[PDB]
Short mmCIF file of C-alpha atoms in Angstrom, two decimals:
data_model
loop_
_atom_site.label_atom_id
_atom_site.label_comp_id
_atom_site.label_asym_id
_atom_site.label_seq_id
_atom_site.Cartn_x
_atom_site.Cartn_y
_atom_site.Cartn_z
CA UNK A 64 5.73 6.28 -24.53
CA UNK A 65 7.82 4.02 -22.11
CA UNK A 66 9.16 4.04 -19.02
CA UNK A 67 11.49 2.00 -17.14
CA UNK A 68 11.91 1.72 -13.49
CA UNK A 69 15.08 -0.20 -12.15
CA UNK A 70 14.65 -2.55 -15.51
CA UNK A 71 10.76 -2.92 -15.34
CA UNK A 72 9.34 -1.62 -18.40
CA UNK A 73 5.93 0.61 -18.08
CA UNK A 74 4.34 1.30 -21.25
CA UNK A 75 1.96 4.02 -22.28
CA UNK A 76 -1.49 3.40 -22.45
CA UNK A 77 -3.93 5.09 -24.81
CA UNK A 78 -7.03 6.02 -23.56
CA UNK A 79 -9.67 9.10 -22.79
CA UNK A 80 -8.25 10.51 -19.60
CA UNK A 81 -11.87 12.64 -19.17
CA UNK A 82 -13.96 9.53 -19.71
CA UNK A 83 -11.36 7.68 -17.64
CA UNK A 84 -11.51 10.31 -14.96
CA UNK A 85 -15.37 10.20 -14.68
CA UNK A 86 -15.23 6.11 -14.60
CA UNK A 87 -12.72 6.41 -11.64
CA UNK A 88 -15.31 8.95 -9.88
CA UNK A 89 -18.44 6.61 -10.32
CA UNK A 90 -15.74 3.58 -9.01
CA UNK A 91 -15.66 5.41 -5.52
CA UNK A 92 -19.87 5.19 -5.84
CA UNK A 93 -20.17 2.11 -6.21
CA UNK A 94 -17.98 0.55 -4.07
CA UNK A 95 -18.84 -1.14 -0.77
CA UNK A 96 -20.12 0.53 2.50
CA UNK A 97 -21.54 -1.03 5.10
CA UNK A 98 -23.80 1.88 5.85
CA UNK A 99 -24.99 2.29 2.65
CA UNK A 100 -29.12 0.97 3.17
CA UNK A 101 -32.04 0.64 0.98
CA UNK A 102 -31.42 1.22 -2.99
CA UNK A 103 -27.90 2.36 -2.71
CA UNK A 104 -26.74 -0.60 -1.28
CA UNK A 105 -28.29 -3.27 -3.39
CA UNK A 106 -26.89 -1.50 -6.27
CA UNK A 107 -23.29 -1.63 -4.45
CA UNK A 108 -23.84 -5.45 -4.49
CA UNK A 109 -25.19 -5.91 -7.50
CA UNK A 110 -21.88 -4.40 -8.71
CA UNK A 111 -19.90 -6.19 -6.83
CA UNK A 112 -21.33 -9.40 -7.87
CA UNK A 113 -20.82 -8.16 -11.43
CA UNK A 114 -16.83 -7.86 -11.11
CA UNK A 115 -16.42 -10.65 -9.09
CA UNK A 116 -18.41 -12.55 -11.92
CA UNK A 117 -16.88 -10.64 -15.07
CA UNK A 118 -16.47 -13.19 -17.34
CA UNK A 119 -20.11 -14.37 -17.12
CA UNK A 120 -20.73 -15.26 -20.32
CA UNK A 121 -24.14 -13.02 -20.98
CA UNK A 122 -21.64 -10.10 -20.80
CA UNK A 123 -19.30 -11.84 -23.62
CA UNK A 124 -20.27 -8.94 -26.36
CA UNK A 125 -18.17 -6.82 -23.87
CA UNK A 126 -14.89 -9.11 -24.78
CA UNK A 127 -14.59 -7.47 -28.34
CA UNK A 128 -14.30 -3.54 -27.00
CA UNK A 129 -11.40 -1.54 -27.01
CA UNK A 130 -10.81 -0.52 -23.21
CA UNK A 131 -12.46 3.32 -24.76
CA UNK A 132 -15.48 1.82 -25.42
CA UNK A 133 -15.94 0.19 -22.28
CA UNK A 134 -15.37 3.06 -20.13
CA UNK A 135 -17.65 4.66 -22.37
CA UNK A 136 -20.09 1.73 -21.45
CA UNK A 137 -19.47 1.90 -17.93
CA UNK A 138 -20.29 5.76 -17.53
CA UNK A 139 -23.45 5.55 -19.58
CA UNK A 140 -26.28 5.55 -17.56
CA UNK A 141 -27.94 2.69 -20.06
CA UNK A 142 -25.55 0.26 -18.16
CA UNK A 143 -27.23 -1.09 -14.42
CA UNK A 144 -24.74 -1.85 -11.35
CA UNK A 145 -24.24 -5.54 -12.39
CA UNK A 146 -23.05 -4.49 -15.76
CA UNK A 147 -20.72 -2.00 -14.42
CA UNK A 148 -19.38 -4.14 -11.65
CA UNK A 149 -18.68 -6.15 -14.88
CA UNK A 150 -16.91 -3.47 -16.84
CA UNK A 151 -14.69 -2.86 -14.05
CA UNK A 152 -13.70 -6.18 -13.75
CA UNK A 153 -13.08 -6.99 -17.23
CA UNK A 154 -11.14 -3.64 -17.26
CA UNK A 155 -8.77 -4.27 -14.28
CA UNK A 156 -5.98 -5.00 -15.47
CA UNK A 157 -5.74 -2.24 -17.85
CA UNK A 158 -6.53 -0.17 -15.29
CA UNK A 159 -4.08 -1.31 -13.22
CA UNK A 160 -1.27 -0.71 -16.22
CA UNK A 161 -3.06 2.94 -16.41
CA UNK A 162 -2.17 3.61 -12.63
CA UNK A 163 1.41 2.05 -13.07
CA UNK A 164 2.49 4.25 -15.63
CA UNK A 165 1.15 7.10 -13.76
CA UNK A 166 3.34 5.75 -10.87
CA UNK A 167 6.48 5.22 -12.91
CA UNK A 168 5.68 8.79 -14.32
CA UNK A 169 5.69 10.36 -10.57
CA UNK A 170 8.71 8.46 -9.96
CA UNK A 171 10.48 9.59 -12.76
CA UNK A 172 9.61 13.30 -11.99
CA UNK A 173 10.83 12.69 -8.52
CA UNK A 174 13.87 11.52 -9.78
CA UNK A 175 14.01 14.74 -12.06
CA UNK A 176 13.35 16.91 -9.45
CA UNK A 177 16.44 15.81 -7.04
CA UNK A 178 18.92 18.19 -9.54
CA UNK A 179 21.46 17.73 -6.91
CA UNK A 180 21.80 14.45 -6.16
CA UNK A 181 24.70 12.47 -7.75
CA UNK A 182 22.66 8.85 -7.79
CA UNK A 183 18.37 7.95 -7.78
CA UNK A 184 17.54 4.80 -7.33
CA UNK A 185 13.39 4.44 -8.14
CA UNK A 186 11.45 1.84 -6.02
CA UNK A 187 8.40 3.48 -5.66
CA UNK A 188 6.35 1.03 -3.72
CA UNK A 189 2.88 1.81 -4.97
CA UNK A 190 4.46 -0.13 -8.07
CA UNK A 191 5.72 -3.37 -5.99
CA UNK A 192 3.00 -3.33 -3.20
CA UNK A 193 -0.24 -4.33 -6.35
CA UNK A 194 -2.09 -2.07 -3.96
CA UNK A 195 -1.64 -3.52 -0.88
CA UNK A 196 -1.02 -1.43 2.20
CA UNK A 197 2.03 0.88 2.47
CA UNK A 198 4.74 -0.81 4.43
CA UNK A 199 6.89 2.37 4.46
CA UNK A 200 7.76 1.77 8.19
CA UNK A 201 9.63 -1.27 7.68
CA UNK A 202 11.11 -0.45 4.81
CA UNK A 203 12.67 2.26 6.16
CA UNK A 204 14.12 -0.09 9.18
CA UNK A 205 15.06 -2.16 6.69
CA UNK A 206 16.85 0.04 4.51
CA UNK A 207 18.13 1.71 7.24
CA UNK A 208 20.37 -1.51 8.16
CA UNK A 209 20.88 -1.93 4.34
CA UNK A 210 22.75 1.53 3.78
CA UNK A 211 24.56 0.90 7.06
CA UNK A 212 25.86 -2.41 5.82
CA UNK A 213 26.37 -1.98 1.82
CA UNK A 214 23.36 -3.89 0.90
CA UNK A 215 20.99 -0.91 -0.23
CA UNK A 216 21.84 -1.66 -3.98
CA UNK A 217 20.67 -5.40 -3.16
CA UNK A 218 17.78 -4.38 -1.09
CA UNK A 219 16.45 -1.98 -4.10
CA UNK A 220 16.49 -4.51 -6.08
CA UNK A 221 14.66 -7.09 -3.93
CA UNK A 222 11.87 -5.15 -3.03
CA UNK A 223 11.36 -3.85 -6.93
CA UNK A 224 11.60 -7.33 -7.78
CA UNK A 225 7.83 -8.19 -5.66
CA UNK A 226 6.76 -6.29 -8.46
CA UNK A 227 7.18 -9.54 -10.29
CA UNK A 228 5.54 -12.15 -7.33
CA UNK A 229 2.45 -13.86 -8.62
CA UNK A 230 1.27 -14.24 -5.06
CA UNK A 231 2.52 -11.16 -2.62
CA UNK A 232 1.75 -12.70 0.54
CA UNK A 233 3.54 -15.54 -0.21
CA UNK A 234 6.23 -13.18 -1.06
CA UNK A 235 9.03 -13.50 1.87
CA UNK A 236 10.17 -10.22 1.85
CA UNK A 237 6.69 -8.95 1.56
CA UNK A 238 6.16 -11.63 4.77
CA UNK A 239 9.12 -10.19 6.27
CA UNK A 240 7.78 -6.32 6.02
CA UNK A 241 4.43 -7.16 7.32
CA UNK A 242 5.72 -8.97 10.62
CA UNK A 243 8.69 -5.49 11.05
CA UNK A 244 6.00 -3.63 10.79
CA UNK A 245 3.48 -5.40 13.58
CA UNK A 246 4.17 -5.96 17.40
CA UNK A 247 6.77 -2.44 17.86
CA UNK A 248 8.96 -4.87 16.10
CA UNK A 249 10.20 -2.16 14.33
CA UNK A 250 10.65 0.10 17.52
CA UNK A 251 13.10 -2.07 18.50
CA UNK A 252 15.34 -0.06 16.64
CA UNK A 253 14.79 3.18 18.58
CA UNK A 254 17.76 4.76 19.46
CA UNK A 261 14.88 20.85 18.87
CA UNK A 262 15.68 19.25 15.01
CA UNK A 263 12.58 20.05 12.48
CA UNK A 264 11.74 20.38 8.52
CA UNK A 265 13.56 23.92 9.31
CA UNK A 266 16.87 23.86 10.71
CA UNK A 267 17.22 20.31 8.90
CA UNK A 268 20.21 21.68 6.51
CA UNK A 269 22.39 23.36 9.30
CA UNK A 270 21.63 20.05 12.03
CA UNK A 271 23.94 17.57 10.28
CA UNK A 272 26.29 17.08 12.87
CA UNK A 273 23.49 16.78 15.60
CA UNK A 274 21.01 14.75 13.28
CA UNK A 275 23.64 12.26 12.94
CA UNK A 276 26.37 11.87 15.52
CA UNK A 277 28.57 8.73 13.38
CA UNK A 278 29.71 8.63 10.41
CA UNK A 279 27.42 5.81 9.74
CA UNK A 280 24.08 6.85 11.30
CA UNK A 281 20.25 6.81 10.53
CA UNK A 282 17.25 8.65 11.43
CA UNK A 283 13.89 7.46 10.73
CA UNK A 284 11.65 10.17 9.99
CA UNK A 285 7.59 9.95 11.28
CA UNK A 286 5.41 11.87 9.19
CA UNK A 287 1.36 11.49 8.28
CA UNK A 288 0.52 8.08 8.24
CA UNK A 289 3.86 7.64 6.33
CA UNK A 290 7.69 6.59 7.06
CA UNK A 291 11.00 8.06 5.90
CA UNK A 292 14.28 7.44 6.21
CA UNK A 293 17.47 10.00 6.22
CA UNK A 294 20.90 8.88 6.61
CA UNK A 295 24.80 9.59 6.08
CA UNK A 296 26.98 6.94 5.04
CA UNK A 297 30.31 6.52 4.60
CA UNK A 302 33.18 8.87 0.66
CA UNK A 303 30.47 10.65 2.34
CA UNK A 304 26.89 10.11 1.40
CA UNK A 305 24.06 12.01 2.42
CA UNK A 306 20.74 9.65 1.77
CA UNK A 307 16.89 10.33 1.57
CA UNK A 308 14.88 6.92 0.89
CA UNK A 309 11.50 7.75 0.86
CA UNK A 310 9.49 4.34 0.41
CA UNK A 311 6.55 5.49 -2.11
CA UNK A 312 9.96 6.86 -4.75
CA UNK A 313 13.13 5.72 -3.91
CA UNK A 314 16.55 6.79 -2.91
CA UNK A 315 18.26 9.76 -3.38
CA UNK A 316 22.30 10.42 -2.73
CA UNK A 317 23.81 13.63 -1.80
CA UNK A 318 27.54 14.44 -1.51
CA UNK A 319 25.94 17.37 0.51
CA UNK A 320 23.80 17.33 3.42
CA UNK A 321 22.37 20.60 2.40
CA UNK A 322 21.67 19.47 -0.65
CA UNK A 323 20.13 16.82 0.79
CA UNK A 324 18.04 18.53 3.55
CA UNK A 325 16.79 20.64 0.79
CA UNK A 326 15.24 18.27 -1.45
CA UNK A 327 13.79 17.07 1.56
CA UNK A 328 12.15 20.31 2.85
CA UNK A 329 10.90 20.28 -0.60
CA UNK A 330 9.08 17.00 -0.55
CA UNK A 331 7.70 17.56 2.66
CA UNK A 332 5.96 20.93 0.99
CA UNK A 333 5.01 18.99 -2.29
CA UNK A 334 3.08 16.30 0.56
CA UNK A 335 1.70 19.27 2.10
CA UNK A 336 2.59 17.51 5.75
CA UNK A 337 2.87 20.45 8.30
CA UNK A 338 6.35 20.85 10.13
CA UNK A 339 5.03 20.10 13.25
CA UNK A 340 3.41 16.53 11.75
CA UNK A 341 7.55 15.25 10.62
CA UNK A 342 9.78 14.38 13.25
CA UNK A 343 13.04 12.99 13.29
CA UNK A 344 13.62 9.45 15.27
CA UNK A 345 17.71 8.37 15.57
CA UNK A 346 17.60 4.49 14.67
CA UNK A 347 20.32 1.97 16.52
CA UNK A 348 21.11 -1.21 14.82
CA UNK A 349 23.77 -2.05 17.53
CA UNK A 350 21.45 -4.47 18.43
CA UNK A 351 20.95 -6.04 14.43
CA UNK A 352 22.31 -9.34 15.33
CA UNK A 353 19.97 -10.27 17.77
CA UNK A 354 16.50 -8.94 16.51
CA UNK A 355 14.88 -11.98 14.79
CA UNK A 356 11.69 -11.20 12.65
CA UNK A 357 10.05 -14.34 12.25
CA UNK A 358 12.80 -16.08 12.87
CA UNK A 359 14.97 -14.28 10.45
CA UNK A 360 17.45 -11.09 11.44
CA UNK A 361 17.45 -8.32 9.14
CA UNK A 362 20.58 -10.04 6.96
CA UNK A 363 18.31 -12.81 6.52
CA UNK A 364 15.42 -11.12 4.94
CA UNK A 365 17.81 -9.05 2.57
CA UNK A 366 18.65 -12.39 1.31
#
C-alpha cells in the first residue's frame, strides 16, 4: 500500500497493469527517431506535439478521466498520434508515481534479500535522478571518500534528498556528480581478483583497514569497501548500501547481484581507489568535503 524509502513516502497506485503494460509498449512506438521517414514519422511528431501541448484545451474532456480510462483511451486505436501524445502527457505524472513505487518496491526487495547484513540503507537512484542519466560512477567516488571519512550516513541522505529538488540541474550535488563524472575526473582516484574468488580475496582486495575498491561493470559503477568495528560495505548506486560484519557475507550478496544483473564475470572488475590525494582534487572548485556539504 505504502512504502517508504529513507523517510520519502511512495504510495500505491491503482491501476490496470495489462492495459498499463500495453500503453508503455505503444510509448516506445511512438517516440522519436530520427530515421523514422514517411508516415511513421509524422505520426511520431504529431505525438510529440500532442504531449508537449497536453493541456490544449480541445482535449479538456480528457481532464475528468480516471488515469484507467485514459490508458484505455490511449491504447484504443479510435485515438490518432496527437491525441495520444496528449494522453501521455496529461498522464505523466502518474506515470511517473507508477514507476516510483515500482522502484521503491525493487529497493525494498533488495533490501530483503541482503539476510545477512546487519544495516541497508536504500538510495536507489532511479528514485533521486527523475530519469536523468545514471551517475553511478561518481557516486561511487563519492561514497567511497564518504565511508572512508564517516560521512556515508550524511551523504545517503543528501543524495535521497534530490529526490525533493524542483530543478535537478540546478541541484549542486547533482552539479557536483555530473562534473566527477566528466574529464577522468573521477580517475583521479585510481589507485587475478574476480566475481569468484571475491569471498576468500579480502585481505588482497583491500590491503588497510580503511580501503575501497570501485567495481566496473556494464555500463554501471559499484563500490565495495571495509571500514573500520569492522564493516564490510557494498553500495551499489541504483539500491543502496549494504553492511556486513563479514566479508563473506558480503562477497556473497554480491556474487548474487551480479547473477540477478546477469553481467558476465569477465564484464566486473575490481579497481583499488586512493583518496590520499582527497585534499587536493577540486571538482568545480569544490573537494569532495565540499560537495558532501
Amino acid at each position: 500500500k505504502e512504502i517508504t524509502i529513507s523517510g520519502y513516502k511512495f504510495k500505491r497506485i491503482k491501476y490496470n497493469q495489462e492495459n498499463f503494460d500495453t500503453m508503455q509498449r505503444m510509448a516506445l512506438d511512438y517516440a522519436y527517431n530520427p530515421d523514422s521517414k514517411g508516415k511513421i514519422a509524422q505520426a511520431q511528431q504529431a505525438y510529440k506535439t500532442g504531449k508537449e501541448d497536453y493541456n490544449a484545451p480541445q482535449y479538456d474532456n480528457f481532464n475528468g478521466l480516471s488515469l484507467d480510462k485514459k490508458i484505455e483511451r490511449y491504447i484504443s486505436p479510435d485515438t490518432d498520434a496527437t491525441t495520444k501524445g496528449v494522453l501521455a502527457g496529461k498522464m505523466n505524472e502518474s506515470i511517473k508515481d507508477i514507476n516510483a513505487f515500482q522502484t521503491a518496491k525493487d529497493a525494498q526487495s533488495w533490501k530483503k534479500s541482503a539476510n545477512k547484513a546487519n544495516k541497508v540503507v536504500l538510495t536507489p537512484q532511479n528514485l533521486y535522478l527523475k530519469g536523468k542519466p545514471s551517475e553511478a560512477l561518481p557516486e561511487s567516488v563519492l561514497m567511497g571518500w564518504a565511508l572512508q571519512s564517516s560521512q556515508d550516513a550524511k551523504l545517503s541522505k543528501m543524495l535521497m534528498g534530490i529526490y525533493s529538488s524542483n530543478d535537478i540541474t540546478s541541484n549542486p550535488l547533482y552539479k557536483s556528480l555530473k562534473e566527477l563524472h566528466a574529464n577522468g575526473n573521477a580517475s583521479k582516484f585510481n589507485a587475478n581478483i574476480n566475481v569468484s574468488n571475491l569471498a576468500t580475496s579480502e585481505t588482497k582486495l583491500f590491503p588497510t583497514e580503511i580501503s575501497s575498491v570501485r567495481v566496473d561493470a556494464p555500463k554501471h559503477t559499484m563500490l565495495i569497501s571495509k571500514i573500520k568495528k569492522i564493516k564490510y560495505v557494498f553500495y551499489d548506486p541504483n539500491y543502496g548500501m549494504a553492511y556486513f560484519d563479514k566479508h563473506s557475507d558480503m562477497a556473497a550478496f554480491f556474487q548474487k547481484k551480479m547473477q540477478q544483473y546477469d553481467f558476465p564475470d569477465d564484464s566486473v572488475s575490481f579497481h583499488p581507489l586512493d583518496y590520499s590525494n582527497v585534499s587536493d582534487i577540486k571538482i568545480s572548485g569544490r573537494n569532495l568535503n565540499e560537495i558532501i556539504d
